[PDB]
């Protein structure tokens, strides 16, 4: 079985540097052309860099958007390909895949991807505010999880006992550079006077854990 396994992603400030690595197995590594391809919501899939086989002087090729800033290399004794990045930009943010290109045609094998986040935001835990069930069948309530960085947070309800009807929305980046999301749940109106509802928020990058009891507003 062919396997490509990337590592080295993470958080870095603009102007920063970071090196990605990929280890291959299941094919004759030194015969083949190894690539980095990145993916972002704004630009989709973009080829980044290629290093060809030593038999053809192991030539390197770069996308214009990274030329002069990124360096691709390989160590055939380790079945490894590397991507050294420098002068990083916010728009370099994305998921970086190691990939084999079959001699100038398809990208016929891909890794699992490693995430690069280029941002000047400081690591920070969220504030959690109740979305109280309206005093006016089915009721909706939730928690607003505001101003944290970086991703992700996890949200459960009643320590995981409540899962049906929960919607934890994807985070949105605010102009401040911090993320915000809401987690909401629909429950029977009749249960508001008999059942407590608590959202459990965990933000591991800041070692923040918050339990917020959500109740009707008096």
């Amino acid at each position: 079985e062919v396997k490509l396994e990337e590592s080295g992603g993470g958080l870095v400030q603009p102007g920063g540097s970071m090196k990605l690595s990929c280890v291959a197995s299941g094919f004759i590594f030194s015969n083949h052309w190894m690539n980095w391809v990145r993916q972002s919501p704004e630009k989709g899939l973009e080829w980044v860099a290629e290093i060809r086989s030593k038999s053809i002087n192991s030539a390197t090729h770069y996308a214009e958007s990274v030329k002069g800033r990124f360096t691709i290399s390989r160590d055939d004794s380790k079945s490894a390909v590397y991507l050294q990045m420098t002068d990083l930009r916010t728009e370099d943010t994305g998921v970086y895949y190691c990939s084999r290109n079959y001699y100038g045609s398809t990208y016929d094998y891909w890794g699992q991807g490693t995430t690069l986040t280029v941002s000047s935001a400081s690591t920070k835990g969220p504030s959690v505010f109740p979305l109280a069930p309206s005093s006016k069948g089915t009721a909706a309530l939730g928690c607003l999880v505001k101003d944290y960085f970086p991703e992700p947070v996890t949200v459960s309800w009643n320590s995981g006992a409540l899962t049906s009807g929960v919607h934890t929305f994807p985070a949105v980046l605010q102009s401040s550079g911090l993320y915000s999301l809401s987690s909401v749940v629909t429950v029977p109106s009749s249960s508001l006077g008999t059942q407590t509802y608590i959202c459990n928020v965990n933000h591991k990058p800041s070692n923040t854990k918050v339990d917020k009891k959500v109740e009707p507003k008096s």
């Binding site: 989709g44 899939l45 973009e46 080829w47 090729h61 996308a63 895949y97 290109n101 100038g104 045609s105 398809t106 990208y107 016929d108 891909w110 890794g111 699992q112 991807g113 504030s127 505010f129 109740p130 979305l131 109280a132 309206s134 005093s135 089915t138 909706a140 939730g142 607003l144 505001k146 919607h167 929305f169 994807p170 985070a171 949105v172 605010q174 915000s180 999301l181 809401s182 909401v184 629909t186 507003k217």
Partner: protein, 214 residues
């Protein structure tokens, strides 16, 4: 670079339907178009090479056709494991480039959103900020229009929307629209209203509240 235009961006498929999607190159690319599948949280997977050649181990319901500039991927009866994004890629000339992708989603009958509005909490107000949240729960299709009105003034530029992935059990979407103001701006006005337009509603739904009343 050669640009690949994929259409539609979103294709809705009923279970059992035969579907196809399109990839158009901005110049001649011969037969050098390759197709990939990417499931949620997964990596791209090569399905079809050189416009029409299926890869070994790929199911027979996938087939591709086309040459020159216009290419088509077809799935003769979609299965649930085919719900994914699909990308084309050209290797006719350097650098190699990818289309923007077609998302395949589950088609179901129309379902109207259930709409809820949440005032900012007292706790948040004490911090200097007010977030007003409008929730659209379990609706289909995904297209919806949400407009904020503050003392009858239509708001622009101060809200953000977020949409869930399609629900695995009922195939609906949910959406949040969050209006963010400073505390001072929030306290300058009284009536906060979210107006929701959706195909499933016989008339647009407004949920509103008066600031500081309950």
């Amino acid at each position: 670079d050669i640009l690949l235009t994929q259409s539609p961006a979103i294709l809705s498929v009923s279970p059992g339907e035969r579907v196809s999607f399109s990839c158009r190159a901005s110049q001649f690319v011969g037969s050098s178009i390759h197709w990939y599948q990417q499931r949620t949280n997964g990596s791209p997977r090569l399905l079809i090479k050189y416009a029409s050649e299926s890869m070994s181990g790929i199911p027979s319901r996938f087939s591709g056709s086309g040459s020159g500039t216009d290419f088509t991927l077809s799935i003769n009866t979609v299965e649930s494991e085919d719900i994914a994004d699909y990308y084309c890629q050209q290797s006719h000339s350097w650098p190699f480039t990818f289309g923007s992708g077609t998302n395949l989603e589950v088609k179901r009958t129309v379902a109207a959103p259930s709409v809820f509005i949440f005032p900012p909490s007292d706790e948040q107000l004490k911090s200097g900020t007010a977030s007003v949240v409008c929730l659209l729960n379990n609706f289909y299709p995904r297209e919806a229009k949400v407009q904020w009105k503050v003392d009858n003034a239509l708001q622009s530029g101060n809200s953000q929307e977020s949409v869930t992935e399609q629900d695995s059990k009922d195939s609906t979407y949910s959406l949040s629209s969050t209006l963010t103001l400073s505390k001072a701006d929030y306290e300058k006005h009284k009536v906060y209203a979210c107006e929701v337009t959706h195909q499933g509603l016989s008339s647009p739904v407004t949920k509103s509240f008066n600031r500081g009343e309950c």
